Symmetry: D2
Subunit: 208 residues, 4 copies
Amino acid sequence: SVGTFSLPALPYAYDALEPSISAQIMELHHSKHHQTYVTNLNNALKTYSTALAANDVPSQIALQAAIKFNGGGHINHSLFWENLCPASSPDADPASAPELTAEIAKTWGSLDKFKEAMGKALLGIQGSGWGWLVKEGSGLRIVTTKDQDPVVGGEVPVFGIDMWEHAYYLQYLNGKAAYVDNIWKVINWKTAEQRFKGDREDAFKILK
Amino acid sequence: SVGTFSLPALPYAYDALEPSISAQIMELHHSKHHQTYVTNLNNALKTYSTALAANDVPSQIALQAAIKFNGGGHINHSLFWENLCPASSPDADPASAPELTAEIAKTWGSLDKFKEAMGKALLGIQGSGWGWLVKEGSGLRIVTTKDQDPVVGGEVPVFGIDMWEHAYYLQYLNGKAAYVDNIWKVINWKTAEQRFKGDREDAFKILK
Amino acid sequence: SVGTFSLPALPYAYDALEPSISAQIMELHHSKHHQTYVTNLNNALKTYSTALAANDVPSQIALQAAIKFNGGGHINHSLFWENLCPASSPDADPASAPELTAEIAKTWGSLDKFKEAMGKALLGIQGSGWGWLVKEGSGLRIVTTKDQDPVVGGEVPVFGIDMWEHAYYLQYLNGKAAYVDNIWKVINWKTAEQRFKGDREDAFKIL
Amino acid sequence: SVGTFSLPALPYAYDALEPSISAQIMELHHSKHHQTYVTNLNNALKTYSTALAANDVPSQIALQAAIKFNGGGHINHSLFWENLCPASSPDADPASAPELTAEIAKTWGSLDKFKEAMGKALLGIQGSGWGWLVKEGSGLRIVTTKDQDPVVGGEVPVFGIDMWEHAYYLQYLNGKAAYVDNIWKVINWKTAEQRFKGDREDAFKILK
Ligand SMILES: [Mn+2]
Ligand SMILES: [Mn+2]
Ligand SMILES: [Mn+2]
Ligand SMILES: [Mn+2]
């Protein structure tokens, strides 16, 4: 039936990503922001099914923003929690992603240069948005999305980093550069390797 | 059933709007451009139906652009044919719309000053789009929409003028100012009066 | 000389808007966020000035995003500080704005109905942006702008409310509804009345 | 001094791209559309010079839409005329572009599959816009731009194809598929090769 999504539990405790991300942020981000996206996604999808069955095209178009914003919020945050892990986990080691790092090194020259390029794109976002490493065809690309827009159909998301102010402000204030510097310690490279090796449908399987 | 829209017949013959709009433009515009929007709207809606029942949010979001573009294309042209009529028809006399023209005069000063204001907005559209007279509450506003974006936000559309190049190029070449000057002769003020006196749902009944 | 905008001083101390807006937010909002928009605006205008003289149109177009983002950031925040004041100030009383409130009541029915309608627009902003009460001709309208986009040429801004998360998150966390409820206590209605009675050029004289 | 652009002459006669593009379109496209972009760009640049000297940031921002639209119009058409040539010319032979066609074949598999992917992107444009083959770093990409937006700062334009309806409507009516199929015969692969081997400013040297 339509609109039966639920907030996924995190793979770790709310304080497991410290000191990179504070427990307060993880709790607010998951139990408030992501929760709201889930509930509002379900509400909009059920109303949309009514508009679709009645062939009400004006209502359908008017509902697109709520589905894109809340649907994207659910897609993006679901992907986000999964490509994070405690800094002490072996999954935080890029040696967990040999195939991905090889393609990363082939594209940007080195892992450090990819990190520099992505950091630049993350800090360059005006307003709210996300930075993504994506697979397009067989090649890798850094892309940004505004607000909660999900990665555009055709690209395989490898990992994403949330640059909305609620992802860092309580801990880093306006210092988003320090936030980006610290989040590398908690990137789940095992997850990134698995997404790089699968296709679009495989990546979105966590939503199931 | 989902996605069973069909192209409505015009209220007049293809040459009935001459000399303001040529028979060739009317036939191509109706039987090709509008027909394509109808067909591609129906295709997108059937695909959407599958993704909605499967709770496939990435596909639902990816389908939004086709639904808005082709759905808006169907909405906009359906309204368009109805707010046109042969220049010799009594429906082309603005005296057919006493309440609307009085409110127009209250807002812009006179019918001529509104025509100049709407003309300016139409000629100012960069690229493809539409100009609309809309009712917001009890007041009137001139708005433009890009591409085939419809006036679906809550406003009641009173009449629209298509500024896509296919609406005039074969007859007026790049002279869109001459096209706008001549379309006033075939504006259906009887239709505009009914929309001005009705609500949002009445105006969209044309889609039935 | 090109690109000499500076950070305007606030009309009050950093803690003057408590309890509606904390001193910590005011100091960060003013001394870091707004200051950054000023500096990057000046940098963008200096580069643009040469690209304009060189008839280098690709550079001019490539610089537009920084000029709109940082220029709007400077415009919006400069307007913002001026239509805020301490809650006990006489300027926080809407009786300080007789002509504006009369037109507000004529348009929305009452001041409460207008506050709710603007609240709805503020809370509906997806992502970062601003809510504005503006004058177009003789009538009032509620509009929202994305990111730091300033109010569209032709409208006179009457007052604006910042809905960027940095404007409230340290104090209200995700509770933007409570932020909006409390910011009504520190709206400067004397400033709003003055903007309502002047034109677009008047409201932009503070820069 | 500011705003002294002029309409460049075509590299060939108005009928030189026939039969792919008619002389009627070439003359209107060049002497009316592109000419209007030049004139309106110069006016906007002069007005900006006034707003800049007055330290008027609101007017500067309000002027951006006219500078991007007319400045982009001038850039895109200037590049466009240069990457077209008579179909019987040796420059129309893709063998004139050995390094570029090798990178195309390495990226898309063959020239025919690249033409197929670009054709799909060109026909997929909603409203007015352009399709581009661009270079980013060492890689090739098909991108589209809306209205007269020029290619995003950072990419090197290799060649563009105008999908505004004024580019084909008089000759092909709504048949943009026939227009694209025929324009391949007049693509200047000598121009494309030179741009592929140069950088961003080299490609914009045509504006001098
Ligand atoms: Mn988030
Ligand atoms: Mn049309
Ligand atoms: Mn702010
Ligand atoms: Mn063109």
